Design a protein around this ligand. Structure first.
Ligand SMILES: Cc1cc(CCCCCCCOc2ccc(C3=N[C@@H](C)CO3)cc2)on1
Ligand SMILES: Cc1cc(CCCCCCCOc2ccc(C3=N[C@@H](C)CO3)cc2)on1
Lengths: 236, 273, 255, 40, 273, 59, 59, 57, 40, 40
């Protein structure tokens, strides 16, 4: 008989501990694995695939239309859309990125925001996208917007433009859940010159917008998502 | 590892930021393709986002309850909770369910922890000490009829006996019939015109039966069982869109009617911040 | 002078040419291949009809109009009646296959509109009834007709609400599945190569569909002034590397 | 040290440290180079 | 090591005891610079004054309380202490606080011990055996509303279940967002005219929720939770003047008005002994 | 199963003992350290800095 | 005295676990084995012997 | 280990499927003696049918 | 590691991995070859 | 022997045995020698 002493914590059950256990089914042989395409190893692998952002959130019931950012022909100087960058809330929240970020407490890294244009091929347009780093207000006019991170996008044969929100930060991690101290800025978009439709054409054209994370990205300290809950256990 | 390299002014014919999303690719664009950057290192590995880590902590998967009371004159033990039973399944509670259904096929060993606590809602002199016996009743094997049937002999069926207030823990290998468990299944068990659709038909795992071994004392004792499940040795294939609407049933994808808009409406314009 | 843009796919006795492609997607970066022995279970030698089943079948055409919500086809169902592919299907106990899907929609440089073409492995549909109502067989086996998401709820059928992918997930996130867009201004076809994806090495072709192909208008069709307000969309699909096993009497399936 | 005989009884697995998003982010048939035109 | 060397009479032009304190230095003068000394050795290392040792013992950081009782008809569990919750913080109790605030920035892993004891202030037949479940609810994750919400499933959030009367112990890595925790912060969360000043805005650590898993017995049971915290792997920068006045608030430096003189007045003259 | 005997003191909590514990946050990666001037290692380092004495205590 | 911590599952009895136990009969010597024809090692050995099927179940 | 070997058409004078059960033997006939098979491996050892396992719980 | 002195006290035995059905399936005195006629 | 995988779970650290008061006691820009005049 070897002398032992038990410490504080004996008998506790910590849902996060990782130890060995007896197998209830001694000697059982599991089914062989066969090959299946698509294996995922890290959630970091999947948040780099871009998905659509319901940017046009202004509706009243969920609709395919809140994915469409409208553009008006012949407007000059004006603003196309605006949003803050709380990736865990608001427009971002239902996107795959938003949806995964919510399983973690802290995030750090660059984001990739792209816009794909869908107007007739014989039209043309020049837009400016601007990222405003924390510390200033959402820009109120392009002059204000153009003094921060921006890209003049020229609509052409190449249909999409990929803007990166480079990680601009004092503190090396921000909370996913809306924190002030930890806030990331604003994203706005304005006409640089203006949309022009060809003859025989009319109305609004739309941009689709996507979001995905750069390879830069870090997420840490897992927790429970506000995105799902329940009141009684389900049954069959 | 560098998180960003140093990059300076650019005036090229080589534009990495113009792409065609119609192709289905997400081109790997970085901050340094469109602003001037400085070197910085990652200092991070992405350890805690590994799927083994993501699915590897215990989650509550089931709460049931049984009572110790005089079975004298009870015509239906099962019905008196003289011994409940649970149709093993992993979608009855939703926190873990949404996590698993981020994948289509999943393969893992399970580690179960079972916590049992007792309650004595009406006048008792004391708290008795009860031993629970949880049996694994796979499909094809006699299922218990009374709280003290021959079934409980469990001569060939793994069973664990632990005390109420304590915890029991053991681990079961991946018991799936195929190479992975289907998180989803767009099929039937056969080409029947009225057979059920879904996985309910595939995830035939059998049930697990709990009972108190103790005979009855003078008062009644409620024992409530909580089953926790931890995936170990995880393998996951084919990522899918996360669950947006609420769940209604074990094993079907169905959402409730007149549900509410899941996308938050802006308080303001598209232009609003 | 090769462009990403022009392409030719010859499979069996049938060829497709596109002069306005946008590359092609190969699901999960894997190309269809036959079933290796190391992965095999059934001891039966399989049958590989080759060129008589691995050719291009063009399903009947759809009509995109300003009110369209989107269409959904299931595989191998959509092909249950095409030539010898279909016969083999009803006659063997088990079968396995990959596909090349080519979705076609041409317009002019004055039109606008953008379709999402996506392949979803194991697309289990939801009942519009809620609760645990099931979706009857016939409803998930529309055949070449596919399911029309702008048709009415029917009884025992699935829900046809587009912002929810017919299953409780948001349209916006379908992009995690192999997919390609058809943006009239860019593109006129979409091509996806689908490797066989299952948790078993070979399965039944009638009780289980292993992918749904979905074509969904996202930016509404907008025709030039006084143009007819609609465009046809055509889907052509070719089984590839098909194998059938466990031949016998010939399945009888509901309806 | 494993104290138990069966593999299911061992603790959690250890980090894939695999990580390759290209099956998801770039499943295109003809390779796309960043910087070269998307559609030629 | 010598504590003092031998030194004899001196009649020099080299005076080590005259200095200019205006410079900000404390010149390293020793007994042997001004008296005649003999050799002596230190016999000591200064082991127990290492900062790891100084901050490394468990200190009580929080006492809360929850009760097990029939929740039937309770409209606000939180309010009935059917499950309390604690806004994790490390300045609520002062013994440890004064110790930490001897430094400006501090970095360490935490080891928590949680002792839970039960009380039955009014007539009970017995002492029941309750299991406590403490959850970590970091900020952004659903916070419990009833004592038996879906939240308690805690499928992704670390939780420990232990018995009242026992102790639970686990250790959490340094969870700070920056490189160190700020013991002080002369800033705001943004340039707002009315935002709060201090660290309250920085030490956003989220809260920890406790509840009893047991249903209710016939009597009521008070369970009082004591959280102990031990720093391990300590790193401390920039020493500061020790706290002289009493504390009034978590996270602000504020002292009470009409406080009392903190320097003891002489009973006698400056000349007094 | 290896035979053991538990000694007096089992289960006690001594605020001054130093042992290992399970981490509640398995696999989490702490923020990198950056350099900060002023690190203190021993309280013996700081009690050698001189400070003023309120000698005139008579108020 | 070596410090220990007990985990969840301590004290449980799992009918399928396989561990060592003290022998109640220390030092006892079992009867020698003699040879007996017919040893079975696997149930897989015996299910390969064919047996009759009551196919005509209609009684 | 192979569970089934590959075997093709047969037109022989050597018939493994005709036997005389009166002898008391169970002749070791396999799928490949009477249909055309493909190779497949066992992937299994028969561990949990060992008599030690069967009587050991 | 055995902690106990007697052999009865050790854990379960380990798989025969013996397996030879012929004492049961082919106890015939003159050897029968599959494919050759049963009765000559 | 660490029984646990993560570094936070290890016991207390071990004595700096670093000790250098000069950053606090003599942060002067031009070095002062004891015995030499303070102000020259
Ligand atoms: C005593 C005792 C009690 C037991 C129980 C043995 C465990 C058997 C359960 C096997 C695992 O069960 C499932 C069920 C469903 C799923 C699953 N459904 C999908 C959503 C995903 O995974 C996985 C495992 O063993 N010994
Ligand atoms: C179950 C379970 C419960 C828990 C809790 C996890 C620990 C999280 C707490 C993190 C440490 O919190 C702080 C808070 C404040 C300070 C601090 N404030 C300043 C005075 C100095 O330090 C340091 C750590 O984990 N698992």
């Amino acid at each position: 008989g070897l002398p032992t002493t038990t410490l504080p914590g004996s008998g506790q059950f910590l849902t996060t501990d990782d130890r060995q256990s007896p197998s209830a089914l001694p000697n059982y042989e599991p089914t062989p694995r066969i090959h299946i395409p698509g294996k995922v190893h890290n959630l970091l692998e999947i948040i780099q695939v871009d998905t659509l952002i319901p940017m046009n959130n202004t509706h009243t019931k969920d609709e395919v239309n809140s994915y469409l950012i409208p553009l008006n022909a012949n407007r000059q100087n004006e603003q196309v859309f605006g949003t803050n960058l709380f990736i865990g809330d608001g427009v971002f929240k239902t996107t795959l990125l938003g949806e995964i970020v919510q399983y973690y407490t802290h995030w750090s890294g660059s984001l990739r925001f792209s816009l794909m244009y869908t107007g007739p091929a014989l039209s043309s347009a020049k837009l400016i996208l601007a990222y405003t780093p924390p510390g200033a207000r959402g820009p109120q006019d392009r002059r204000e917007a153009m003094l921060g991170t921006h890209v003049v996008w020229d609509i052409g044969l190449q249909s999409t433009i990929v803007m990166t929100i480079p990680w601009t930060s004092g503190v090396q991690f921000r909370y996913t859940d809306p924190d002030t101290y930890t806030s990331a800025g604003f994203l706005s978009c304005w006409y640089q010159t203006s949309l022009i439709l060809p003859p025989e054409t009319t109305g609004q054209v739309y941009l689709l917008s996507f979001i995905s994370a750069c390879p830069d990205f870090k997420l840490r300290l897992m927790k429970d998502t506000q995105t799902i809950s329940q009141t009684v256990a389900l049954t069959e | 590892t560098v998180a960003s390299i140093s990059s300076g002014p650019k005036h090229t014919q080589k534009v990495p930021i113009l792409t065609a999303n119609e192709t289905g690719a997400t081109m790997p664009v970085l901050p340094s393709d469109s602003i001037e950057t400085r070197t910085t290192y990652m200092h991070f590995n992405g350890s805690e986002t590994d799927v083994e880590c993501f699915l590897g902590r215990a989650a509550c998967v089931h709460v049931t309850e049984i009572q110790n009371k005089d079975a004298t004159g009870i015509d239906n033990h099962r019905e008196a909770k003289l011994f409940n039973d649970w149709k093993i399944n992993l979608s009855s509670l939703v926190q873990l369910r949404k996590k698993l259904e981020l994948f289509t096929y999943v393969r893992f060993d399970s580690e179960y922890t079972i916590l049992a606590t007792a309650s004595q809602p009406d006048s008792a002199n004391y708290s008795s000490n009860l031993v629970v016996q949880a049996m694994y009743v796979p499909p094809g094997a006699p299922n218990p009829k009374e709280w003290d049937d021959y079934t409980w002999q469990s001569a060939s069926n793994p069973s664990v006996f632990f005390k109420v207030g304590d915890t029991s823990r053991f681990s079961v290998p991946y018991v799936g019939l195929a190479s992975a468990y289907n998180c989803f299944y767009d099929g039937y068990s056969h080409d029947d015109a009225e057979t059920q659709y879904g996985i309910t038909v595939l995830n035939h795992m059998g049930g697990m039966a709990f009972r108190i071994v103790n005979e009855h004392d003078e008062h009644k004792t409620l024992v409530k069982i909580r089953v926790y499940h931890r995936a170990k040795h995880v393998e996951a294939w084919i990522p899918r869109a996360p669950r947006a609407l609420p769940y209604t049933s074990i094993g079907r994808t169905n959402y409730p009617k007149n549900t509410e808009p899941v996308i938050k409406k802006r308080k303001g314009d598209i232009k609003s911040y | 002078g090769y462009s990403d843009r022009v392409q030719q796919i010859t499979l069996g006795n049938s060829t497709i040419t596109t002069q306005e492609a946008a590359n092609a997607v190969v699901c999960y970066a894997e190309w269809p291949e036959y079933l290796p022995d190391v992965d095999a279970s059934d001891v039966n030698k399989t049958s590989k009809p080759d060129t008589s089943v691995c050719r291009f079948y063009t399903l009947d055409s759809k009509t995109w109009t300003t009110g369209s919500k989107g269409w959904c086809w299931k595989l191998p169902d959509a092909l249950k009646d095409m030539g010898v592919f279909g016969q083999n299907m009803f006659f063997h106990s088990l079968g396995r296959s990959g596909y090349t899907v080519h979705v076609q929609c041409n317009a002019t440089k004055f039109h606008s509109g953008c379709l999402l073409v996506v392949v979803i492995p194991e697309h289990q549909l939801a009942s519009h009834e809620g609760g645990n109502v099931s979706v009857k067989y016939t409803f998930t086996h529309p055949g070449e007709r596919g399911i029309d998401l702008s048709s009415a709820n029917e009884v025992g059928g699935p829900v046809k609400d587009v912002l929810y992918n017919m299953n409780g997930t948001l349209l916006g996130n379908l992009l995690i599945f192999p997919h390609q867009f058809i943006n009239l201004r860019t593109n006129n076809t979409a091509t996806i190569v689908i490797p066989y994806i299952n948790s078993v090495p070979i399965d039944s072709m009638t009780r289980h569909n292993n992918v749904s192909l979905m074509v969904i208008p996202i930016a509404p069709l907008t025709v030039p002034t006084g143009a007819t307000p609609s465009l046809p969309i055509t889907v052509t699909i070719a089984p590839m590397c098909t194998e059938f096993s466990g031949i016998r009497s010939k399945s009888i399936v509901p309806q | 040290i494993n104290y138990y005989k069966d593999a299911a009884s061992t603790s959690s697995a250890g980090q894939s440290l695999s990580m390759d998003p290209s099956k998801f982010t770039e499943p295109v048939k003809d390779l796309m180079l960043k910087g070269a035109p998307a559609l030629n």
